[PDB]
Design a protein around this ligand. Structure first.
Ligand SMILES: [Mg+2]
Ligand SMILES: [Mg+2]
Ligand SMILES: [Mg+2]
Ligand code: NA
Ligand code: NA
Ligand code: NA
Ligand SMILES: [Sr+2]
Length: 140
RNA sequence: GUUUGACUGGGGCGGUACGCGCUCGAAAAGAUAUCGAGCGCGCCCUAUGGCUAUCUCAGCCGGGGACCCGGCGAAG
């Protein structure tokens, strides 16, 4: 029961919300894989009337790439309980978002007979802090 | 030598109910008038057309009014 209940990292999303790009290059080095362009929506007074146009870049790491990054990434932050989502997620900062979830999360990500994960199988800030804190660092 | 139209609570003036589209008037099939009420069309678009693949929107909440992550969300 506990085996299919113990949390895990689904994805590590590192992104730099600029506002006009050239920054892609560093993310590629700090993470290990190709970054992606970020387009914006709606016209913006702040000389941002152009809808589809580069404004940021992100990277979604999964599995090793995720941990190998967090290893030398988490030590760079001072995690606090507040910095945690209601789903058991947390982000710090260049931004670093960590998406944590239980074993059969795919049930809500597959094409056929997908289903929303029950509030019971959903992760919690509490169960989140633990898992993480239970690995190279401290909470609050 | 002729023309100088029609509608109209008489006519003139004003207006166009003079060709079209929608709601209501309209009385739960259809049809239905007044110078009845609300208001539009005489285009625009080579994509703002067509198909396919991938995908889900407003709005609100939580975590780092532009961006990133998560949740709620049959449709506003
Ligand atoms: Mg004669
Ligand atoms: Mg007359
Ligand atoms: Mg009828
Ligand atoms: Na782009
Ligand atoms: Na005439
Ligand atoms: Na009159
Ligand atoms: Sr009179």
């Amino acid at each position: 029961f506990h085996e299919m209940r113990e949390p895990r990292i689904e994805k590590v999303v590192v992104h730099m919300g600029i506002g006009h790009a050239n920054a892609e290059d560093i993310l590629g080095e700090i993470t290990g894989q190709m970054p992606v362009r970020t387009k914006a929506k709606r016209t913006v007074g702040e000389f941002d009337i152009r809808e589809g146009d580069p404004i940021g870049a992100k990277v979604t790491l999964r599995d090793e790439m995720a941990e190998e990054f967090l290893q030398t990434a988490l030590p760079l932050a001072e995690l606090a309980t507040s910095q945690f989502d209601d789903t058991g997620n947390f982000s710090f900062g260049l931004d670093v978002t960590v998406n944590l979830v239980r074993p059969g999360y795919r049930v809500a990500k597959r094409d056929k007979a997908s289903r929303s994960i029950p509030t019971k199988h959903r992760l919690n800030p509490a169960d989140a802090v633990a898992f993480i804190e239970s690995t190279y660092d401290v909470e609050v």
